């Protein structure tokens, strides 16, 4: 707020001899008006009222630059370019302590998002809403945007304990991506050879799909190794705890970075948290069949593949989906819409 | 009991998958062709313009109100309250607005219309509290259909998608878009945030970025636009093609005034403002500002201070909030460059 | 013709657009005696209009008006 | 020896052989409100020992 | 120089941090209060009796960062390196990679700063410089 006015403005009372009768407008005494008035600081109009001559404050323009709606303008501006760029180049982001409003929107807009413990990922603070919602519903911004909301709802992609491992994840991520569009495949000599046979075989009996993908320890006589399809230790997941009937990430097969998809085969159990704000809401627990596309799965599944596509990667997909779920609510919840969208990708 | 339970108009119209519903095949084909009367023959062709019977050099009679209202009236007009059957004209041609996805997410209303016979796509905001009904899943005996109050002037998950869908949909038609924005912000509560309203705000930018024809945005009277709603539709996304106008009675900040005041109108500012303006405080301060006071007078004065100040806080709080709101006004907006000109509805 | 107007409006000038226009007359002058030299019309006008993108929403432009005109 | 460029520092002259080289230990000179924060060992020389000079300067420098 | 008979003074200031990186800030003593003039150099031009920066500036901002559970920005470049060096070793498990570089050689940064027109300018300066 324009400080220059705060310490010298006077109130134009409905009645000065009693302020509690309300106020009409704010104004400045002539020494005080004669100074912001000259400087394109505010917009005023001269007025005669209750006898005296005032420079009635009509609009505050504010000689202090940077405290007005331009900051909101700047925010959209840096959002838009990044959206096109993200579909054009690699963006990665780590939110360490808190991202608020445009900060939140830009990290979120960038999509691949890393979160340090005790941080939160929110746009507007718990205080305003608890007040708007009439009671101290929430006590900490982490309640709104912490991993307990955003990791459980698919807004957080990956989580981290500190900035360093964030930096590690950023740098760890970069090892899969081509430096530019002018650059090739560049191939590694992986320590998992390629012209080997795979020992682990998928089964009718259910199994953790990361083993089909990444390999596994020999269940009995360790330390032997049941080899998987992909290079041991090479796969870097995203969106792990939400809608686990499908799994997305990047890996390397013989040292070429790729994106990788596999399917959980046992029915997934999704926990929906209770909204303490809404007294009806109880924390539901939902069965999510394996090998099925849901509203959630189609949104999340499209995103990993799409990202790889704007990057330029070849894809090797272990495709395993039986259909869309057809119950009233989830169908009502628009799985068709995002199903249509995957086709575009 | 019926495939319509799964995919009937009662699901797809209630969730916005169906744009229009019809009673029979004949009337269906009619609806198809009726939409097309707004659409360009090809992408190489202009929107087909009509010479509308609602004249172009008319004034708009209906004025959006503090009292809640159906937004087609602001957009499409309404009947005159007194001398019926007259019509309070809306912005767009009388009878020209053809809504879609009407019963789903009614906090915002989207459709196609004509302005002086120019077809445009249109999104406007419902002002009465919406009660959105989510049906009960009969498959799951726990699920009961809750019935939720959905505030007006807010972006929800549902509202943002319907708005995103209509806008996305309209953009590929080749229509100019007119958004009569009347959003206080995005909802930041656990459920709506959990239900991913943040996600679709980023997405609209991509959607809005692809626009190839004029989009003229006008914030109608009694609307306000803060933070998320302006930022995600700033002309910066497509400066090449976007232009902006704001009503005198529009508003904009990262944060609306009540939350702004809380930071910058503490006791000190109230006391300071009283001390400058309040006659009693000056009087009190004159005596409290006296040396060599009686131990009687001193403690009473300290009491007089606590009693006068705290008792005085309400009036000066109202005075305090008005000052802040004047910084965020359209007058400043044009000078500071966030709007191009101010019109009168 | 570009000397004489641009000599009498040497002041009141925003140097970003001036260094651009004044460059290319200098290299109108260097590339003279070519069989194929024409004025770079769209270039001088367009360069100024990069700086129309940021200033023009503000009416801050009446010094600028007599230079952008 | 532009030694006023650390007046906001605290340096104590110790007499020393190789008398060219005066080394001072520096404590950030601060106001009464606060206690010194920086703790740097400074070695401050003067160099005049009579292409040869440059090599001489380098070599003498390691020895020094 | 050898023919010239033009004796110049050159207040050269040497810059070395953790690692064997030696950054030489070489200037010339140019006029009226003498002025470090060579590239772009860390604190390229300044007068000569420039009182010496006290460390507790840096210290002060790092405390604020830990208190928000994050890392101070000008400490990030070495944090990039520590993560990056640690990465080069761990990845040698997974793949045949070239030999890692020395900590001094893993990473180099140059500050980018907006001019009046919002255009980029390269600056090789000391940590703690944000405006």
């Amino acid at each position: 707020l324009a400080e220059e006015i705060r310490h010298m403005f006077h109130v134009a009372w409905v009645d000065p001899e009693d302020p509690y009768k309300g106020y009409r407008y704010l104004y400045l005494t002539p020494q005080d008006y004669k100074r912001v008035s000259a400087l394109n600081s505010v917009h005023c109009e001269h007025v005669e009222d209750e006898g005296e001559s005032r420079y009635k404050i009509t609009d505050i323009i504010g000689k202090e630059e940077g405290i007005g709606p331009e900051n909101l303008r700047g925010s959209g501006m840096i959002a838009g370019e990044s959206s096109l760029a993200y579909n054009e180049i690699i963006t990665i982001s780590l939110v360490t302590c808190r991202a608020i409003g445009i900060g939140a929107y830009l990290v979120r807009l960038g999509q691949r998002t890393i979160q340090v413990e005790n941080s939160h990922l929110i746009l507007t603070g718990a205080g305003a809403l608890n007040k708007v919602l009439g009671r101290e519903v929430y006590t900490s911004n982490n309640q709104l945007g912490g991993i307990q909301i955003m990791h459980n709802n698919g807004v957080t992609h990956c989580t981290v304990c500190d900035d360093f491992e964030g930096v590690f994840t950023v740098l760890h991520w970069l090892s899969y991506m081509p430096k530019s569009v002018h650059s090739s495949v560049p191939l590694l000599n992986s320590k998992d050879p390629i012209d080997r046979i795979i020992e682990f075989v998928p089964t009718k009996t259910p199994y953790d799909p990361r083993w089909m993908l990444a390999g596994r320890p020999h269940p009995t006589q360790k330390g032997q190794w049941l080899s998987g399809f992909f290079d041991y230790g090479s796969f870097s997941e995203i969106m792990q705890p939400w809608a686990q009937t499908v799994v997305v990430g990047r890996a390397r097969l013989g040292g070429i970075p790729v994106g990788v998809v596999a399917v959980e085969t046992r029915t997934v159990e999704l926990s929906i948290p209770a909204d303490p704000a809404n007294l009806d809401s109880e924390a539901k627990i939902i069965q999510q069949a394996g090998q099925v596309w849901f509203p959630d799965s189609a949104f999340k599944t499209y995103q990993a593949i799409k990202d790889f596509n704007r990057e330029g990667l070849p894809l090797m997909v272990f495709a395993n989906w039986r259909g869309f779920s057809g119950g009233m609510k989830d169908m009502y919840d628009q799985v068709l819409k995002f199903g249509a969208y995957i086709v575009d990708g | 009991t019926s495939n319509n339970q799964l995919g009937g108009i009662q699901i797809m119209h209630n969730n916005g998958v169906t744009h229009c519903t019809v009673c029979d095949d004949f009337e269906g084909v009619f609806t198809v062709l009726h939409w097309l009367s707004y659409m360009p023959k090809s992408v190489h062709s202009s929107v087909p313009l009509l010479n509308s019977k609602d004249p172009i050099d008319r004034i708009i009679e209906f004025v959006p109100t503090k009292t809640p209202y159906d937004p087609r009236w602001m957009l499409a007009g309404r009947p005159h309250p007194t001398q019926k059957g007259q019509w309070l004209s809306g912005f767009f041609d009388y009878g020209s607005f053809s809504e879609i996805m009407q019963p789903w997410a009614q906090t915002v209303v989207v459709g196609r219309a004509r302005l002086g016979g120019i077809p445009v796509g249109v999104v406007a905001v419902e002002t009465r509290t919406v009660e959105l009904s989510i049906p009960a899943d009969p498959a799951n005996l726990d699920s009961e259909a809750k019935i939720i109050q959905q505030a007006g002037q807010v972006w929800f998950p549902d509202s943002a998608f319907k708005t995103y869908q209509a806008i996305k949909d309209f953009n590929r038609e080749g229509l100019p878009l007119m958004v009569f924005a009347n959003w206080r912000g995005f909802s930041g509560g656990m459920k709506d945030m959990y239900d991913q309203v943040l996600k679709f705000g980023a997405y609209i930018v991509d959607g809005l970025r692809e626009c190839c024809q004029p989009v003229l945005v006008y914030i109608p009277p009694q609307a306000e636009l803060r933070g998320g709603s302006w930022v995600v539709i700033d002309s910066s996304i497509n400066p090449r093609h976007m232009e902006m106008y704001a009503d005198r009675e529009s508003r904009g900040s990262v944060l609306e005034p009540e939350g702004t005041v809380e930071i910058k109108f503490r006791r000190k500012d109230l006391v300071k403002t009283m001390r400058r303006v309040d006659p009693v405080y000056i009087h009190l301060a004159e005596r409290l500002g006296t040396p060599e006071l009686s131990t009687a007078e001193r403690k009473e004065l300290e009491n007089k201070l606590k009693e006068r100040e705290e008792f005085l806080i309400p009036i000066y709080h109202q005075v305090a909030v008005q000052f802040a709101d004047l910084h965020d006004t359209p007058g400043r907006m044009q000078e500071k460059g966030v709007i191009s000109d101010i019109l009168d509805w | 013709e570009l000397q004489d107007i641009m000599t009498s409006v040497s002041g009141r000038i925003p140097p970003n657009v001036e260094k651009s226009i004044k460059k290319e007359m200098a290299q109108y002058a260097s590339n003279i005696t070519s069989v194929l030299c024409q004025f770079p019309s769209q270039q001088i006008a367009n360069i100024l209009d990069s700086h129309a993108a940021t200033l023009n929403r503000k009416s801050e432009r009446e010094v600028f008006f007599m230079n952008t005109q | 020896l532009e030694l006023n460029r650390m007046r906001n520092f605290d340096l104590t002259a110790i007499p020393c052989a190789n008398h060219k080289m005066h080394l001072y230990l520096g404590a950030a000179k601060v106001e009464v409100g606060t206690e010194v924060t920086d703790y740097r060992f400074f070695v401050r020389a003067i160099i005049r020992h009579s292409e040869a000079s440059f090599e001489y300067l380098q070599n003498e420098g390691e020895r020094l | 120089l050898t023919p010239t008979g033009k004796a110049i003074p050159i207040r050269l200031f040497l810059t070395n941090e953790s690692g064997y990186y030696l950054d030489i800030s070489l200037y010339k003593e140019v006029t009226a209060q003498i002025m470090f003039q060579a590239k772009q150099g860390p604190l390229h031009g300044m007068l000569i009796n420039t009182p010496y920066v006290t460390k507790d500036l840096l210290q002060s901002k790092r405390f604020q960062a830990q208190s928000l559970g994050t890392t101070y920005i000008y400490d990030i470049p070495e944090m990039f390196r520590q993560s990056l060096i640690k990465l080069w070793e761990s990845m040698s498990t997974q793949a045949f990679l070239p030999s890692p570089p020395l900590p001094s050689d893993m990473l180099t940064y140059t500050e980018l700063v907006l001019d009046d027109q919002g255009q980029l300018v390269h600056m090789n300066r000391l940590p703690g410089g944000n405006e």
Side-chain angles (χ1 to χ4, degrees):
Chain A
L1 295 164
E3 289 310 319
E4 68 276 33
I5 302 312
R6 196 161 62 183
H7 291 293
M8 63 174 73
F9 76 93
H10 292 79
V11 171
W13 298 102
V14 166
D15 177 19
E17 189 266 328
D18 178 21
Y20 282 157
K21 289 173 69 176
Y23 66 100
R24 293 191 208 255
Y25 56 94
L26 309 180
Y27 67 98
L28 291 173
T29 67
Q31 303 66 240
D32 280 334
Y33 69 52
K34 284 170 189 184
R35 304 167 171 183
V36 297
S37 62
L39 307 167
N40 277 318
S41 192
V42 288
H43 191 269
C44 296
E45 181 59 27
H46 180 281
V47 300
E48 295 173 353
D49 195 356
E50 300 165 356
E52 297 86 9
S53 161
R54 305 159 145 86
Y55 280 10
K56 192 192 275 175
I57 188 64
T58 63
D59 193 357
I60 291 91
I61 307 320
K63 82 193 192 277
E64 188 289 339
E65 296 184 357
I67 59 92
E70 60 276 24
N71 293 294
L72 210 159
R73 171 157 80 72
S75 292
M77 187 179 189
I78 186 183
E81 290 291 324
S82 289
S83 70
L84 170 157
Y86 168 65
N87 287 301
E88 183 200 356
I89 58 174
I90 301 187
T91 199
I92 298 166
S93 312
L94 64 168
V95 72
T96 59
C97 73
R98 53 175 202 287
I100 307 300
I102 184 55
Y105 279 128
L106 293 174
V107 55
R108 180 58 275 173
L109 173 65
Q111 286 183 341
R112 309 265 88 73
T113 297
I114 312 296
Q115 189 177 356
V116 183
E117 285 165 29
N118 79 20
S119 69
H120 53 261
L121 175 43
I122 70 189
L123 294 153
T124 294
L129 296 67
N130 288 338
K131 182 263 289 185
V132 177
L133 297 157
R135 62 173 174 81
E136 184 165 357
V137 174
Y138 304 107
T139 55
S140 152
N141 285 342
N142 287 316
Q143 276 166 3
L144 309 181
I147 66 168
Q148 81 253 40
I149 295 307
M150 300 303 168
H151 198 202
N152 284 322
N153 74 6
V155 170
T156 291
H157 290 198
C158 188
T159 58
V160 294
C161 303
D162 62 18
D163 294 349
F164 177 79
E165 75 200 4
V167 174
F168 179 79
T169 300
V170 174
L171 294 178
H172 168 68
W173 286 353
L174 287 173
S175 77
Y176 300 164
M177 303 173 169
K179 59 189 281 191
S180 79
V181 299
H182 310 102
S183 285
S184 206
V185 292
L187 306 200
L188 294 189
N189 204 166
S190 74
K191 192 188 171 173
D192 203 346
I194 319 83
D195 65 334
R196 77 174 157 78
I197 67 96
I198 306 171
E199 291 167 357
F200 176 80
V201 181
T203 61
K204 298 179 261 63
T205 315
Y207 62 94
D208 190 337
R210 291 161 181 93
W211 301 338
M212 181 182 68
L213 184 165
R216 72 179 291 187
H218 187 42
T220 63
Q221 178 67 40
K222 293 178 184 179
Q224 188 58 38
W225 187 260
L226 292 186
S227 61
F229 181 86
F230 291 100
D231 291 1
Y232 306 158
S234 66
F235 174 65
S236 167
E237 188 169 4
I238 62 186
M239 188 49 71
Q240 62 83 24
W242 177 53
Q244 310 187 348
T245 180
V246 65
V247 173
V248 301
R250 299 188 182 78
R252 291 191 187 81
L253 76 175
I256 307 95
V258 314
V260 182
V261 176
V263 66
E264 181 67 59
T265 66
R266 303 170 296 174
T267 302
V268 159
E269 300 86 335
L270 181 39
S271 184
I272 301 291
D275 180 19
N278 180 183
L279 300 193
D280 296 327
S281 178
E282 293 185 353
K284 190 52 64 67
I285 188 92
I286 284 165
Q287 301 287 120
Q288 289 188 324
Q291 296 172 358
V292 185
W293 269 357
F294 291 178
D296 54 24
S297 306
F299 192 80
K300 73 97 154 166
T301 304
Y302 171 68
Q303 194 183 353
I305 289 90
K306 171 175 69 178
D307 187 351
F308 301 152
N309 176 188
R310 280 91 173 74
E311 190 66 17
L313 289 66
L315 277 165
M316 51 79 57
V317 184
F318 291 160
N320 292 316
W321 289 284
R322 67 100 167 145
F324 292 179
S325 80
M328 194 278 295
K329 188 186 176 48
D330 65 358
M331 287 285 313
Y332 183 83
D333 289 338
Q334 304 178 16
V335 64
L336 277 296
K337 293 193 185 295
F338 296 99
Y341 289 157
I342 186 190
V343 169
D344 297 314
Chain B
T1 56
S2 152
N3 285 342
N4 287 316
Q5 275 166 3
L6 309 181
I9 64 169
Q10 81 253 40
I11 298 307
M12 299 302 97
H13 196 202
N14 284 322
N15 74 6
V17 171
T18 290
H19 288 198
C20 289
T21 57
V22 293
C23 303
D24 62 18
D25 295 349
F26 176 79
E27 190 200 3
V29 175
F30 179 79
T31 301
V32 174
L33 50 87
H34 167 68
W35 286 353
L36 287 173
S37 77
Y38 299 157
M39 303 290 104
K41 190 267 191 300
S42 79
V43 299
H44 311 285
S45 285
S46 205
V47 291
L49 180 276
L50 295 191
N51 204 359
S52 74
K53 296 190 171 173
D54 204 345
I56 62 84
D57 66 333
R58 78 173 158 78
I59 67 95
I60 305 171
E61 291 167 357
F62 177 80
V63 181
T65 61
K66 202 178 262 292
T67 315
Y69 62 92
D70 190 337
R72 291 162 180 94
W73 303 338
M74 58 83 69
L75 185 166
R78 72 178 291 186
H80 187 74
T82 303
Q83 297 178 358
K84 294 178 290 294
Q86 188 58 38
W87 186 259
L88 292 186
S89 61
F91 181 87
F92 291 102
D93 291 330
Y94 66 80
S96 66
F97 175 66
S98 168
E99 187 170 4
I100 62 186
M101 302 180 285
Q102 186 279 128
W104 177 53
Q106 310 187 348
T107 300
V108 172
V109 173
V110 302
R112 301 187 184 78
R114 291 193 187 82
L115 170 62
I118 308 162
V120 316
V122 182
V123 306
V125 188
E126 182 68 59
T127 65
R128 57 97 174 174
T129 303
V130 159
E131 194 85 27
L132 184 287
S133 184
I134 299 290
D137 180 19
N140 180 183
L141 300 193
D142 296 327
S143 178
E144 63 94 354
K146 285 54 65 160
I147 188 92
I148 284 165
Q149 70 286 17
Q150 289 292 91
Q153 296 172 358
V154 185
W155 299 90
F156 290 163
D158 54 24
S159 172
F161 193 80
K162 185 174 154 165
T163 305
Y164 171 68
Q165 193 58 40
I167 289 166
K168 172 177 293 178
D169 187 64
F170 299 154
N171 176 4
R172 172 88 26 72
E173 296 169 347
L175 290 186
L177 278 176
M178 304 196 57
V179 183
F180 292 154
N182 183 1
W183 286 283
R184 304 188 168 147
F186 64 91
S187 80
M190 194 279 295
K191 186 59 72 176
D192 286 357
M193 288 285 313
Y194 183 84
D195 193 74
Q196 304 179 15
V197 65
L198 74 169
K199 292 193 185 295
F200 296 170
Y203 289 154
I204 185 59
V205 167
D206 184 74
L208 179 160
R209 191 178 56 83
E210 293 175 29
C211 298
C212 286
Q213 293 81 19
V215 179
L216 287 177
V217 184
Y218 183 76
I219 300 91
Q222 314 313 125
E224 64 193 0
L225 274 298
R226 310 286 187 180
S229 299
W230 187 261
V231 72
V232 173
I233 69 90
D234 190 75
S235 43
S236 296
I237 288 134
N238 188 351
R240 174 60 178 83
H241 288 114
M242 284 176 75
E243 195 282 342
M244 296 160 173
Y245 293 99
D247 191 87
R248 307 191 160 265
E249 306 306 319
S250 54
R251 287 288 179 285
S253 328
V254 167
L255 188 40
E256 54 89 20
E258 69 192 3
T260 295
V261 296
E262 287 179 2
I263 292 300
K264 296 180 88 60
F265 292 108
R266 310 187 49 68
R267 66 182 57 98
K268 276 75 67 177
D269 192 356
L270 283 287
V271 177
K272 185 278 273 308
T273 54
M274 292 171 200
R275 178 268 185 197
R276 187 165 52 248
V277 166
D278 181 83
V280 165
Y281 194 89
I282 292 157
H283 194 282
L284 291 181
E286 191 181 0
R287 297 172 172 182
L288 180 66
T290 307
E292 65 271 335
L293 283 157
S294 52
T295 38
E297 190 172 3
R298 286 202 294 271
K299 295 180 175 182
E300 70 181 1
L301 279 173
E302 192 63 26
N303 288 342
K304 287 203 207 178
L305 193 53
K306 300 290 98 195
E307 189 274 330
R308 182 53 167 182
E309 167 179 342
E310 279 295 323
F311 171 71
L312 282 173
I313 198 160
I315 187 58
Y316 292 91
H317 185 270
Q318 55 181 10
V319 171
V321 60
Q322 180 281 131
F323 178 72
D325 190 73
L326 283 159
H327 295 67
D328 304 345
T329 60
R332 191 180 187 196
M333 286 177 173
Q334 65 182 357
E335 181 86 35
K336 298 288 291 289
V338 303
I339 65 81
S340 303
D341 220 332
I342 300 159
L343 298 286
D344 184 73
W345 177 253
Chain C
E1 195 69 62
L2 60 85
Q3 73 186 359
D4 191 336
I5 183 170
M6 288 308 299
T7 48
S8 176
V9 199
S10 155
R12 283 84 65 183
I13 182 81
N16 49 354
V17 172
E18 179 265 322
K19 287 183 274 71
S20 300
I21 63 92
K22 267 189 217 294
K23 171 159 96 186
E24 290 294 330
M25 56 184 62
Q27 182 278 134
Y28 183 70
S30 72
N31 77 339
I32 186 58
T33 310
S34 177
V35 61
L36 51 82
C37 60
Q38 66 285 17
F39 197 61
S41 70
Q42 305 196 358
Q43 285 65 232
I44 64 95
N46 77 20
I47 290 157
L48 191 148
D49 298 331
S50 179
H51 183 89
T54 188
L55 174 59
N56 196 2
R57 70 186 62 81
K58 302 188 179 177
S59 70
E60 285 177 351
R61 290 182 292 102
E62 188 176 4
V63 174
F64 177 76
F65 181 79
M66 194 260 171
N67 318 320
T68 179
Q69 279 293 114
Chain D
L1 36 92
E2 190 64 22
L3 195 78
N4 306 123
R5 202 177 157 282
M6 67 163 286
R7 290 175 295 110
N8 299 315
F9 279 109
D10 186 6
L11 44 76
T12 186
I14 300 306
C16 177
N18 178 7
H19 292 268
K20 294 178 185 180
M21 174 271 298
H22 293 74
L23 57 88
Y24 295 167
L25 176 275
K29 187 265 187 182
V30 173
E31 175 55 29
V32 175
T34 299
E35 196 248 332
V36 302
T37 57
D38 311 340
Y39 282 167
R40 284 154 171 140
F41 273 111
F42 300 163
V43 58
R44 293 176 172 262
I46 67 93
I47 294 94
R48 65 168 310 158
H49 191 86
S50 300
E51 67 286 14
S53 327
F54 182 74
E55 46 89 9
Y56 180 75
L57 188 64
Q58 301 296 318
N59 301 128
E60 290 282 332
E62 293 77 355
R63 176 189 58 88
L64 297 151
Chain E
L1 280 299
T2 177
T4 183
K6 182 269 300 184
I8 298 298
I10 53 117
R11 179 72 55 85
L12 192 164
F13 162 70
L14 277 168
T15 50
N16 203 165
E17 66 277 20
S18 180
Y20 299 84
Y21 299 89
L22 71 185
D23 283 327
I24 312 156
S25 56
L26 167 59
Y27 293 123
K28 299 183 186 176
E29 292 198 353
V30 186
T31 318
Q33 295 186 14
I34 308 171
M35 185 163 188
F36 295 103
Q37 289 156 5
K39 74 285 188 179
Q40 202 164 323
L43 275 289
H44 194 268
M46 307 179 283
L47 296 63
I48 54 168
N49 56 12
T50 298
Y52 181 75
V53 169
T54 175
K55 179 61 176 51
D56 60 353
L57 289 172
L58 180 142
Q59 191 55 44
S60 176
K61 276 168 187 159
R62 180 69 173 79
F63 181 81
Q64 274 78 248
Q66 68 177 358
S67 74
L68 286 68
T70 172
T71 300
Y72 185 57
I73 53 145
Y74 288 99
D75 184 73
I76 288 308
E78 283 304 317
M79 195 170 272
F80 274 3
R81 192 189 304 276
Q82 297 319 318
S83 169
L84 192 151
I85 297 169
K86 200 191 157 187
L87 191 150
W88 276 91
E89 282 295 327
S90 69
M91 286 293 166
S92 69
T93 295
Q94 289 188 4
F96 295 102
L97 66 169
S99 296
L102 288 181
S104 51
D105 207 338
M106 310 303 293
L107 76 77
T108 303
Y109 52 92
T110 301
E111 285 70 356
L112 302 165
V113 177
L114 74 165
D115 70 8
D116 297 331
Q117 314 82 19
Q119 285 311 317
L120 74 166
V121 159
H122 288 268
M123 195 169 174
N124 295 308
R125 71 178 181 192
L126 74 156
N130 56 17
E131 63 277 358

